[model samples]
Target: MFEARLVQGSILKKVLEALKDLINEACWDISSSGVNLQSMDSSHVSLVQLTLRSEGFDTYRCDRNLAMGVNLTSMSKILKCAGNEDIITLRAEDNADTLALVFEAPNQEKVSDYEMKLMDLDVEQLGIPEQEYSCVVKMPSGEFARICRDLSHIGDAVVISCAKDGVKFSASGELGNGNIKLSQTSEEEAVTIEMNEPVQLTFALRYLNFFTKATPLSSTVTLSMSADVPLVVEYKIADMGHLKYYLAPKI
Candidate 1:
């Protein structure tokens, strides 16, 4: 049997919201250490990996390692029954056919429980190795989201140009070109960049927008990129860990 209780329901709610658009179903790999989920989009153009450490929860347990397949959209609907502040508990018997979730108010005013159906998933986890990206940009996720929404209206792709000074995002179409240059303010914190060399690459705006669904999950987002490599967009979920995405570059 396995069970875990999270004090903050919003975290899980935000996670499902970020994932549902790209992943149809999710195989939650639960172990003594944590719950891990990794899956690629239908077109295989993007991949998302989410990890919530066992310690992130108020209570967590797993007699042994196991994978629980849950329909993301269905699970998301159940989560909507929760009030962001509700305490959420997940449970399942060893190799059980269904997963149980309970949501309750801290004061016990409203309580809701759901038994979601589960199925075996054939999804395979890909091996993603660490890399020394040519450039790393840290900024507000809301800003990133707006940039993507704004530029996508004019073009289909966004080119990230990073230099030691800062980074720039540009997109063009039949209408015209839109360029947004970000530089570190003297006071610090609006935007920051770390790089030893210049790197620029293009990526589909649609996937970027899908990745930004996690924006509400965190105040900031970190983007790591290298030439000819997939771009990584990561959002830290408090101290629990993070939700990260890897999207193939447009050739």
Candidate 2:
């Protein structure tokens, strides 16, 4: 039997919120450093990798490297039941088939017990090449999300083409062409940076949505992409190492 408790309840809530959009259920690989989750979304268009360090947990101890798979939707509901100041306890039965999540707030208490079943998942980390990218963009997560939402409405697919001129985010459909361009300028609204080398690529709107959904947990999002290659989104969450989501563009 394994049991762990957290005095600050909101930490887990935030972690789950950041993960829910990408994965439904996941096998959390626990280690001495902390708990880490690395899995792609069901669509295969996006990947989510997160690490929570031992410092993030008030009381953390594990006898072994356990892989616990839990339903994200169910886990989200359990987190929702917890108050901000509640003390949370997570326990796994001896057989390790079931998990018990309990919340204790001043005079109130809520508990959720869930059964975990093993799944045959072939999860492999995509080999990321160390190539010099033409354009690298760093912007506020909120702005990126808004840009994706606005451009996606114009077409069934969103094309992100970047070059030495700058980076162009564009979409085309029955409505018309919706495009936004950024360059090396001090514009308050749009962030544009000059590229020493130039590269351009196109990606679908669906994948962009999944990648930007983690904005709630991160202040800034970094994008690194080259022509015809996969796009990478990096979220720098303090204490938690870094969460990265990668997506392959639609041809």
Candidate 3:
């Protein structure tokens, strides 16, 4: 049998919300360490990676590793039924075809259980190599979302130019053109830049907006970019895990 429990069930709800919009189906890997998910968008334009450590859960037990594949939209709907304050437990017996979701009220006055059918998915995992990005920008997640939103209205793409002192976001189109420049500052929401060399890259606002769905997960977001490499957008999930997105730059 495999089981995992979390006192804060709302985190899962938010995680589903963050994922459902980008990926339709995915395999969630259950291992002794924790839960992990990695999938690319249908169009293969972007990729998402998530990791929830076993130590982060209230209780986690896995007799053997299992890969449970399911439709994210369906799981999101079932998770929607759970209250924010509920404690959630996921259970599956060996050779089980279904996964059980149990939600208990904070006061333990009510309990709800739902069984979901798993799917068979033959997904090939891609190997992501480690490399140091030319520039790493850390700023408020909300700010990045807002920038993506505001720029999208002016153009189909946004250009991110990073320098030693600051970062610039600009967009242009037949309607008009606009850009926002942010320099380093000493504050909580300040823009912090770690640069080895200057680089400017362009990306689709549509995919960037999809990535912003995770803004609610963390107050801060980290953006790592290089000349021809994909940009990495990452948000730390509390202290337990991280949600990362990789989007290739537009030509």
Candidate 4:
């Protein structure tokens, strides 16, 4: 038997919401440490890596590491039955084909239970090498989402140019052209950057939009970019874990 309990139901809900568009199916590796998942998008233009630590959960236990393949949409549906304030527990028995979801609302006002079928997915984990990006931009997650939204309206791709002056997000297409330049500042929603030199990269607006779904995970999001490397968009999960998205730059 296996069980992992999260005090807040919304964590799983928001996590799935942020991932479902980029991943339709995935295998979650659960261990004493935590839950880990990494996979590339079907188009192979982007990769998603997730780490949910055991300490992040209300209660987490595992005798041995287990890889549970799941349909993201199905699991997301089960999570939808939970109240935002509910405590959600995930359970599965050894050799079982189904996973159980139990939800208890705050104050014990309500309860809901769901069981979903789990599939055996043959997914190979890719070896992602580490790299020091030239420009690392840290800003409000909501602001990043908003920029992606505005830029996507005018083009299929957006160019990100980072320099000492700051970072510029620009796009041009049939709809016209527009760009937003933000420099370092001291505000609640800050734009902080650490650049070895400078870097400019172009990426698909659609994928960037999909990545912004993680805004709910943290108030701040970090974008790490290099001249020819994949752009890394990361949202720190408070002190618990982190959600990261990597999109290959348009070549």
TM-score for each candidate, following the candidate numbering:
0.97, 0.80, 0.97, 0.96
Alpha carbon lDDT of each predicted model: 0.90, 0.72, 0.93, 0.88
Model 1 lDDT, full chain set: 0.90
Q: How much is the lDDT of residue 138 in candidate 2?
A: 73
Rate residue 124 of model 3 by lDDT. Answer: 70
lDDT of 3 by residue, 107-182 (tens): 8889999999999987977778989999999999999999999998899999999999999999999999999999
- Higher-scoring candidate on lDDT, 1 or 2: 1
Model 2 lDDT per residue over 131-245, tens place: 6666788777888898888987798677776676567788888888988876654522355554666666777777778777677667777788767667778877666567777
Query: Residue-wise lDDT of candidate 1 within 1-251, one digit each (tens)?
Result: 99999999889889989999888887999999998999998898999999899999999999978888889999998888888999999999867799999998888878888998998889777999988888998888988999999999889999889988878999999999999998875511468888967999999999999999998898888899888889999999987989999999987
Clashes per model (N, Cα, C within 3 A) = 0, 0, 0, 0
> Could you arrange the candidates by lDDT from highest to lowest?
3, 1, 4, 2
The runs of at least 3 residues in candidate 1 whose Cα sits more than 4 Å from the true structure, single-residue gaps closed, are: 187-189
lDDT of 3: 0.93
Off by over 4 Å in 4: none
Regions of model 3 farther than 4 Å from truth: none
lDDT of 4 by residue, 45-72 (tens): 8999999998988888787678888899
